[PDB]
Amino acid sequence: APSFPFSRASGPEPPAEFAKLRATNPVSQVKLFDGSLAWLVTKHKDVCFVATSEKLSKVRTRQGFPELSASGKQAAKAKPTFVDMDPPEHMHQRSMVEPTFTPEAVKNLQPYIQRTVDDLLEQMKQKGCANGPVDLVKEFALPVPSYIIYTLLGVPFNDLEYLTQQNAIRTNGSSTAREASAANQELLDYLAILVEQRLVEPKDDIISKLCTEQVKPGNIDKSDAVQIAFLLLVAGNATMVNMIALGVATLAQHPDQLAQLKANPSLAPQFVEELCRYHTASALAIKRTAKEDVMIGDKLVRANEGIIASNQSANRDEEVFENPDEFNMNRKWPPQDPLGFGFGDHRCIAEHLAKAELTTVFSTLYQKFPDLKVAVPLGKINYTPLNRDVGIVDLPVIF
Numbered sequence: 564a565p566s567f568p569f570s571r572a573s574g575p576e577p578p579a580e581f582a583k584l585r586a587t588n589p590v591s592q593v594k595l596f597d598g599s600l601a602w603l604v605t606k607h608k609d610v611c612f613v614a615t616s617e618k619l620s621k622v623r624t625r626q627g628f629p630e631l632s633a634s635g636k637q638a639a640k641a642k643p644t645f646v647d648m649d650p651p652e653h654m655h656q657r658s659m660v661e662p663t664f665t666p667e668a669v670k671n672l673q674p675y676i677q678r679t680v681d682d683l684l685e686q687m688k689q690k691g692c693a694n695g696p697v698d699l700v701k702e703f704a705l706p707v708p709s710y711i712i713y714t715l716l717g718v719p720f721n722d723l724e725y726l727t728q729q730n731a732i733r734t735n736g737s738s739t740a741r742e743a744s745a746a747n748q749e750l751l752d753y754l755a756i757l758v759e760q761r762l763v764e765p766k767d768d769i770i771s772k773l774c775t776e777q778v779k780p781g782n783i784d785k786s787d788a789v790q791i792a793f794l795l796l797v798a799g800n801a802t803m804v805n806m807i808a809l810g811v812a813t814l815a816q817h818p819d820q821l822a823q824l825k826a827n828p829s830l831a832p833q834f835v836e837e838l839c840r841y842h843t844a845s846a847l848a849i850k851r852t853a854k855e856d857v858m859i860g861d862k863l864v865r866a867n868e869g870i871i872a873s874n875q876s877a878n879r880d881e882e883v884f885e886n887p888d889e890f891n892m893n894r895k896w897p898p899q900d901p902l903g904f905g906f907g908d909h910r911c912i913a914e915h916l917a918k919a920e921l922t923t924v925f926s927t928l929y930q931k932f933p934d935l936k937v938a939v940p941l942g943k944i945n946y947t948p949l950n951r952d953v954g955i956v957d958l959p960v961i962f
């Protein structure tokens with residue numbers, strides 16, 4: 564059994580193992596860091612099954628849960644939020660914050676999302692690049708998702724920049740263990756204060772609604788409110804940043820498609836659809852342990868055995884997506900859902916928001932800067948560690 568997680572074939576490529584497994588051993592065993600074994604599911608149909616099977620659990624206190632790192636095993640001890648819950652607890656808590664993420668709520672948020680993007684792009688323009696390149700990530704990819712989620716949660720305008728930098732240090736590869744934890748503690752400390760303030764005088768934000776609707780009635784306590792807010796902040800920010808960056812690098816890799824996007828920004832939605840399928844920036848979140856024996860493919864997964872379902876592999880499943888390794892914004896989509904945001908009950912709570920953010924970004928970026936170009940040869944782009952989810956650390960650009 565090979566060691567998992569696998570390492571990406573190259574910077575923008577997914578691990579080479581998946582394609583081989585999908586064709587020869589779709590449901591196999593991989594060895595984890597602590598030596599334990601887990602079942603790796605690689606086919607779209609099977610990934611979907613794992614994501615919805617009632618015989619599988621996301622509770623991390625069950626022996627056999629596939630923790631991929633030493634830290635992940637330690638994080639499993641704390642009190643769980645809905646991300647690690649099974650029904651009925653899962654929706655009991657998730658529904659407490661879902662209202663802000665519904666399709667209708669996100670549609671009504673479009674003007675705000677646009678404004679946030681426009682203001683950051685103009686700040687980037689004024690900042691100019693007459694003396695050299697600017698880092699698209701630091702100046703645009705990082706603050707877009709950050710400001711939006713922080714603002715939705717209830718953080719005031721003046722605190723955004725500092726909090727955005729701190730949350731980044733959390734996941735920054737350059738950060739030492741101590742720096743990442745201190746930054747993490749800071750965000751939690753800040754959130755604790757916000758909850759206290761919002762309990763006194765609620766405002767129009769997520770934290771306020773949790774305080775008024777759940778904390779006050781006694782459904783959850785203050786710490787719970789802080790943890791749910793923390794989850795919403797750290798669950799998808801780093802991923803949003805990587806998606807925007809990979810989107811720009813991808814358009815630079817396929818000039819004709821960039822020309823097409825510029826010529827018709829109305830194509831942004833489909834470009835985003837293909838981007839989320841082609842670049843699965845969160846490929847290690849669909850994990851479970853079997854509550855009881857369950858049959859998947861030609862394998863029997865026994866009770867208490869862990870399972871990892873690669874939505875990244877499923878998104879390159881040739882049986883579902885024709886020419887899967889070809890990035891095509893004009894792709895003819897099949898009836899099967901691409902799985903960039905997971906599947907089933909736990910499907911990304913912010914999928915509509917994330918897509919709206921990306922669609923706004925790619926229907927605006929090149930209209931603001933029609934001549935935007937990566938200021939380094941594309942083959943020298945600084946990507947995330949090959950053994951980690953796909954993403955880009957920094958992207959020098961000129962415009």
Ligand code: HEM
Nearest residue numbers: 646795798799803845848903904905906909910911913917
């Ligand atoms: C484009 C960026 C994003 C991608 C690609 C993404 C992807 C995912 C994936 C693959 C999962 C696993 C779903 C499953 O278990 O089947 C997930 C879960 C989740 N995401 Fe996102 N996400 C993104 C942005 C966001 C944002 C912006 C937020 C916060 C506002 C967020 C909050 C969450 C939460 C809370 C969960 C857990 C849902 C649950 O377990 O019920 N995500 N996301």
